Design a protein around this ligand. Structure first.
Ligand SMILES: O=C(Cc1cccc(C#Cc2cccnc2)c1)Nc1cccc(C(F)(F)F)c1
Length: 302
């Protein structure tokens, strides 16, 4: 915010990822204790530091400074936060918590649903159905916070969520240029890149994102979680078929198709997903209600 983090205290250790106007490195802080405040909570402390890419242009710099401004709006346990910045002079940095379990798509991909609940040792690559709910509830809480600020994410998906120790989830936004998730985006020259498989029908037709389209994307993201990210949404359809599907929602003649129920997903939970994909934006559930259902109702056996 007002005072720059001491850049001299960072020791860079490895690359975590690379985006459109910046890249993220793991760093160590030699003495973490004397930097502590309310904005700044083995023996070395690890942080993740985003910096400008080496091919940095004036345009990338501008995008970096705006990113700092945008992220400064956001303070919530389940939204990524800036511990510190270096923007008074070069090189420019954004410092955040190191989330050691990486993005949620890669994390869930490496796990399997538990055969029998709580029968395994710590560390085994298994995850329980209640943990999936807990993961989902956290994303919903993060989205509830964003909705109160009238802040529209525009690209919610597991690939933009981070996983910390003890399964804390934080929503982030890594942009749309990563090689790893290129199949998730539909590109046309001179047009905005679009994650159509997560997009409400009205966005595909009008390109207008709202809190209600964020709810639709949360429905798809929840589907991802319950699939343990084993398949792409609408995976057996082409991009063009997925775009045509939005036209079918528009004409409203009952020919639109939906994501199928995941194996780990009970029918009651799947009805919630379907409500997120309601044709009319007003009928999609608010995040406060999505969170309530995921934190509580979903624990019912009746
Ligand atoms: O998330 C970003 C980009 C960004 C910036 C600084 C650090 C990191 C990281 C990291 C990392 C990676 C692996 C392990 N641990 C940490 C990511 N921007 C952004 C822009 C607008 C809105 C939002 C939000 F909050 F609404 F989602 C987020």
């Amino acid at each position: 915010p007002r005072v720059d983090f001491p850049r001299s205290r960072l020791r860079f250790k490895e690359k975590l990822g690379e985006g459109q106007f910046g890249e993220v490195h793991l760093c160590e802080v030699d003495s973490p204790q004397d930097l502590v405040s309310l904005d700044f909570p083995g023996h070395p402390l690890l942080v993740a530091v985003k910096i400008l890419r080496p091919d940095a242009t004036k345009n990338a710099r501008n995008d970096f400074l705006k990113e700092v401004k945008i992220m400064s709006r956001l303070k919530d346990p389940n939204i990524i936060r800036l511990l510190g910045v270096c923007v008074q002079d070069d090189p420019l940095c954004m410092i955040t918590d190191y989330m050691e379990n990486g993005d949620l798509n890669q994390f869930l991909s490496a796990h399997q649903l538990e055969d029998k609940a709580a029968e395994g040792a710590p560390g085994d690559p298994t995850i329980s159905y209640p943990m999936l709910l807990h993961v989902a509830a956290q994303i919903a809480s993060g989205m509830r916070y964003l909705a109160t600020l009238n802040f529209v994410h525009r690209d919610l998906a597991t690939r933009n969520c981070l996983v910390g120790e003890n399964f804390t989830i934080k929503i982030a936004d890594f942009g749309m240029s990563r090689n790893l998730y290129a199949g998730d985006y539909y590109r046309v020259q001179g047009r905005a890149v679009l994650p159509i498989r997560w997009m409400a029908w009205e966005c595909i037709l009008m390109g207008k994102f709202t809190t209600a389209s964020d709810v639709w994307a949360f429905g798809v993201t929840l589907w991802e979680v319950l699939m343990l990210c084993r398949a792409q949404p609408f995976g057996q359809l082409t991009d063009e078929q997925v775009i045509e599907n939005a036209g079918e929602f528009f004409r409203d003649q009952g020919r639109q198709v939906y994501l199928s129920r995941p194996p780990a997903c009970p029918q009651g939970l799947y009805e919630l997903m379907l409500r997120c994909w309601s044709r009319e934006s007003e009928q999609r559930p608010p995040f406060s209600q999505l969170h309530r259902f995921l934190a509580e109702d979903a624990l019912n056996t009746v």
